[PDB]
Design an enzyme around this catalytic site. Structure first.
Site, PDB file in Angstrom:
ATOM      1  N   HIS A  41       0.800  -1.211   0.000  1.00  0.00           N
ATOM      2  CA  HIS A  41       0.000   0.000   0.000  1.00  0.00           C
ATOM      3  C   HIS A  41       0.840   1.271   0.000  1.00  0.00           C
ATOM      4  O   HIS A  41       0.279   2.360   0.111  1.00  0.00           O
ATOM      5  CB  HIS A  41      -1.019  -0.049   1.149  1.00  0.00           C
ATOM      6  CG  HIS A  41      -0.549  -0.782   2.368  1.00  0.00           C
ATOM      7  ND1 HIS A  41       0.125  -0.175   3.405  1.00  0.00           N
ATOM      8  CD2 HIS A  41      -0.644  -2.093   2.698  1.00  0.00           C
ATOM      9  CE1 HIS A  41       0.401  -1.075   4.334  1.00  0.00           C
ATOM     10  NE2 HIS A  41      -0.052  -2.249   3.927  1.00  0.00           N
ATOM     11  N   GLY A 143       3.978   5.912  10.420  1.00  0.00           N
ATOM     12  CA  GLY A 143       5.270   5.806   9.769  1.00  0.00           C
ATOM     13  C   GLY A 143       6.007   4.506   9.993  1.00  0.00           C
ATOM     14  O   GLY A 143       7.105   4.338   9.439  1.00  0.00           O
ATOM     15  N   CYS A 145       4.934   1.268   9.351  1.00  0.00           N
ATOM     16  CA  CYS A 145       4.690   0.126   8.473  1.00  0.00           C
ATOM     17  C   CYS A 145       5.931  -0.238   7.672  1.00  0.00           C
ATOM     18  O   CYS A 145       6.705   0.627   7.252  1.00  0.00           O
ATOM     19  CB  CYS A 145       3.536   0.399   7.515  1.00  0.00           C
ATOM     20  SG  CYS A 145       1.961   0.571   8.345  1.00  0.00           S
TER      21      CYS A 145
HETATM   22  C1  HUR Z   1     -11.016   3.541   9.109  1.00  0.00           C
HETATM   23  O1  HUR Z   1      -9.676   3.000   9.177  1.00  0.00           O
HETATM   24  C2  HUR Z   1      -9.309   2.521  10.406  1.00  0.00           C
HETATM   25  C3  HUR Z   1     -10.201   2.493  11.475  1.00  0.00           C
HETATM   26  C4  HUR Z   1      -9.756   1.998  12.689  1.00  0.00           C
HETATM   27  C5  HUR Z   1      -8.434   1.554  12.760  1.00  0.00           C
HETATM   28  C6  HUR Z   1      -7.613   1.599  11.709  1.00  0.00           C
HETATM   29  N1  HUR Z   1      -6.330   1.227  11.573  1.00  0.00           N
HETATM   30  C7  HUR Z   1      -5.951   1.467  10.316  1.00  0.00           C
HETATM   31  C8  HUR Z   1      -4.692   1.195   9.879  1.00  0.00           C
HETATM   32  O2  HUR Z   1      -3.870   0.709  10.658  1.00  0.00           O
HETATM   33  N2  HUR Z   1      -4.337   1.506   8.610  1.00  0.00           N
HETATM   34  C9  HUR Z   1      -2.981   1.209   8.086  1.00  0.00           C
HETATM   35  C10 HUR Z   1      -2.933   1.338   6.555  1.00  0.00           C
HETATM   36  C11 HUR Z   1      -3.814   0.261   5.912  1.00  0.00           C
HETATM   37  C12 HUR Z   1      -4.086   0.632   4.452  1.00  0.00           C
HETATM   38  C13 HUR Z   1      -3.108  -1.091   5.925  1.00  0.00           C
HETATM   39  C14 HUR Z   1      -1.916   2.125   8.693  1.00  0.00           C
HETATM   40  O3  HUR Z   1      -2.154   3.319   8.909  1.00  0.00           O
HETATM   41  N3  HUR Z   1      -0.736   1.522   8.926  1.00  0.00           N
HETATM   42  C15 HUR Z   1       0.426   2.252   9.460  1.00  0.00           C
HETATM   43  C16 HUR Z   1       0.862   1.738  10.859  1.00  0.00           C
HETATM   44  C17 HUR Z   1      -0.175   2.211  11.901  1.00  0.00           C
HETATM   45  C18 HUR Z   1      -0.105   3.734  12.102  1.00  0.00           C
HETATM   46  C19 HUR Z   1      -0.622   3.871  13.533  1.00  0.00           C
HETATM   47  N4  HUR Z   1      -0.031   2.682  14.243  1.00  0.00           N
HETATM   48  C20 HUR Z   1       0.205   1.738  13.316  1.00  0.00           C
HETATM   49  O4  HUR Z   1       0.657   0.623  13.567  1.00  0.00           O
HETATM   50  C21 HUR Z   1       1.583   2.313   8.452  1.00  0.00           C
HETATM   51  O5  HUR Z   1       2.665   2.759   8.864  1.00  0.00           O
HETATM   52  C22 HUR Z   1       1.183   2.673   7.210  1.00  0.00           C
HETATM   53  N5  HUR Z   1       0.963   3.966   6.944  1.00  0.00           N
HETATM   54  C23 HUR Z   1       0.563   4.267   5.679  1.00  0.00           C
HETATM   55  C24 HUR Z   1       0.276   5.474   5.179  1.00  0.00           C
HETATM   56  C25 HUR Z   1      -0.129   5.633   3.851  1.00  0.00           C
HETATM   57  C26 HUR Z   1      -0.224   4.511   3.045  1.00  0.00           C
HETATM   58  C27 HUR Z   1       0.084   3.274   3.598  1.00  0.00           C
HETATM   59  C28 HUR Z   1       0.454   3.187   4.873  1.00  0.00           C
HETATM   60  S1  HUR Z   1       0.865   1.811   5.789  1.00  0.00           S
HETATM   61  C29 HUR Z   1      -7.003   1.999   9.657  1.00  0.00           C
HETATM   62  C30 HUR Z   1      -8.037   2.074  10.525  1.00  0.00           C
END
Ligand code: HUR
Ligand code: HUR
Lengths: 303, 303
Positions: A41, A143, A145
């Site tokens: 992603h 940041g 992931c």
């Molecule tokens: C309505 O949506 C929600 C409702 C309720 C809980 C929720 N949790 C997440 C959710 O985790 N999303 C994923 C991303 C998804 C697509 C896998 C995400 O932000 N991953 C982070 C690690 C997260 C950040 C906070 N602490 C963590 O571990 C990562 O660094 C990534 N950043 C980005 C930024 C831009 C593009 C890709 C990425 S991938 C969504 C969500």
């Protein structure tokens, strides 16, 4: 002596962390030989994230859309492909610090070290267990992931986790290094729930053996139980069933301490039914289940 | 989010670990620039260890009595000198992996990462706090002496600990990298006692702020107290006094959560007087005091 939650030394993995940028999105990546691995992603835009069609999104990319940075040096991307929820980028340079490695998927109840990274730069290392419900209780910020989890055996790094998501409950979800999620999660911007969790019984017993080896004995008793009768109590307290293989795995610790596994099970039953009465075990006031038998033997052999 | 005991990435220190052998005794050493640092009792024989005269023992050594091994490569010793309880060996080769570094002595209540090493080979990394009584609750086996503790700030490794001893109580004692012991301990084969310990109040408060940032709120209350009246309760429970500087240091966490420090002190007072009633905070059933305000801000900023 002493018993501490302990991570593997992280230097071999530090030498593999890079930064992958696509558009305005930058994630951590893992550079091994001439391939960089990162969460797919990275190719998403804010509009794509609710339910991306990743095959479509990636067909619309070419090699020059990916900027890979290893320190201050940019790596030329010369190929790209989808690996389930992981993107693979072929670069024109093999990582000269590539350790001996493999990709191994772990089982619930097993532990691994996490190297938390931000902007491709390592920030901290910690240990955690894969829960029975396939989440981990991590510490991850925006940041993070693409940070990975691993174990080290002799010289070989076995990578087992790459980080993708934080659930509404504040626990974390991710994939193996083949891009296959642990548990029933998907890489979308949606709120997802894990199944109910359970306590890892064999690990609690391992940690009680660690305690005895380190001089904590107050919870011991002259009593023993049977496996069947222990598991009847375990089910009541949301503990996993104890198998004969679990008993066999605990054999060495049983031999070191001279305490039969079923004798320790009688201590655990009493602890489960009576609490601790304001006492501690290895500095904890609750029963700890994130140390494997292997983790215990690694710190307690020879004590 | 999430809050985990987290060590600094250890790779910069891994690149400095070597093995020093004198006679039949082999200890870990730290290779920085063209100097190797190790515990001076590498020069001891089993007969010398009850009360060595180290000045005498070292005058009876020359450079060729020291075998320094960096991996499989032996390092030529070209000078030696005593540095309090540390031996300094000048070698003919500067370590090409020397990071930016300094030697800093830490205060009780501060934390650092330990890279446990055996046979010059890194084995695990963990975090620990310097206790008020100048011991650390570590995890160290036979062969661990010369392992070091450190903090990393930007690119700079601040070394603060080298390991020497395990007390009868199973806690650990050592020196700064100038060879000066933390606390009233000496490098002899004798049983030694530490002073009575106390709980690091400012760190407990930092960790309660970490909990609030991570959604644990059950211990909060509408009440506040005064500093004087808090410290009257603190003294009763063997907690350190809270200073205005402690309050000021907690300012950022106070601002992030909107909870005044003295309001949190009222929660701590109630927790101290009432216990937890079978509840947990950040996965612990007791009040944790080995996270500094800095440690908390590092994992909780931006949550
Ligand atoms: C309505 O949506 C929600 C409702 C309720 C809980 C929720 N949790 C997440 C959710 O985790 N999303 C994923 C991303 C998804 C697509 C896998 C995400 O932000 N991953 C982070 C690690 C997260 C950040 C906070 N602490 C963590 O571990 C990562 O660094 C990534 N950043 C980005 C930024 C831009 C593009 C890709 C990425 S991938 C969504 C969500
Ligand atoms: C009657 O004597 C005792 C009574 C009650 C408790 C006691 N503790 C110690 C005590 O700790 N001695 C020191 C050594 C002293 C000289 C500083 C020691 O063995 N350090 C270890 C680390 C220890 C090992 C166990 N876990 C640890 O952390 C270290 O690796 C070193 N090994 C050697 C081996 C040979 C030569 C130098 C060293 S230095 C003695 C003792």
């Amino acid at each position: 002596s002493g018993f501490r939650k302990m991570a593997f030394p992280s230097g071999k993995v530090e030498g593999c962390m890079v930064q992958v940028t696509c558009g305005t999105t930058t994630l951590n990546g893992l550079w091994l030989d001439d391939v960089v691995y990162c969460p797919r992603h990275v190719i998403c835009t804010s509009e794509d994230m609710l339910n991306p069609n990743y095959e479509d999104l990636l067909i619309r990319k070419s090699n020059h859309n990916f900027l890979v940075q290893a320190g201050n040096v940019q790596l030329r991307v010369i190929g790209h492909s989808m690996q389930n929820c992981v993107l693979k980028l072929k670069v024109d340079t093999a990582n000269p610090k590539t350790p001996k490695y493999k990709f191994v998927r772990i089982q619930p109840g097993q532990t691994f070290s996490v190297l938390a990274c931000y902007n491709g730069s390592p920030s901290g290392v910690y240990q955690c267990a894969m829960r029975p419900n396939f989440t981990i209780k991590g510490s991850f910020l925006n940041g993070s992931c693409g940070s990975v989890g691993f174990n080290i055996d002799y010289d070989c790094v076995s990578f087992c986790y790459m980080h993708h998501m934080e659930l509404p409950t504040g626990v974390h979800a991710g994939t193996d290094l083949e891009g296959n999620f642990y548990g029933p999660f998907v890489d979308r911007q949606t709120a997802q729930a894990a199944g109910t969790d359970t306590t890892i019984t064999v690990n609690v017993l391992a940690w009680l053996y660690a305690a005895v080896i380190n001089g904590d004995r107050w919870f011991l008793n002259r009593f023993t139980t049977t496996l069947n009768d222990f598991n009847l109590v375990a089910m009541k307290y949301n503990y996993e069933p104890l198998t004969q293989d679990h008993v066999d795995i605990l054999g060495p610790l049983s031999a070191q301490t001279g305490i039969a596994v079923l004798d320790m099970c009688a201590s655990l039953k009493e602890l489960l039914q009576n609490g601790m009465n304001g006492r501690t075990i290895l500095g904890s006031a609750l029963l700890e289940d994130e140390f494997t038998p292997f983790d215990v033997v690694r710190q307690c052999s020879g004590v």
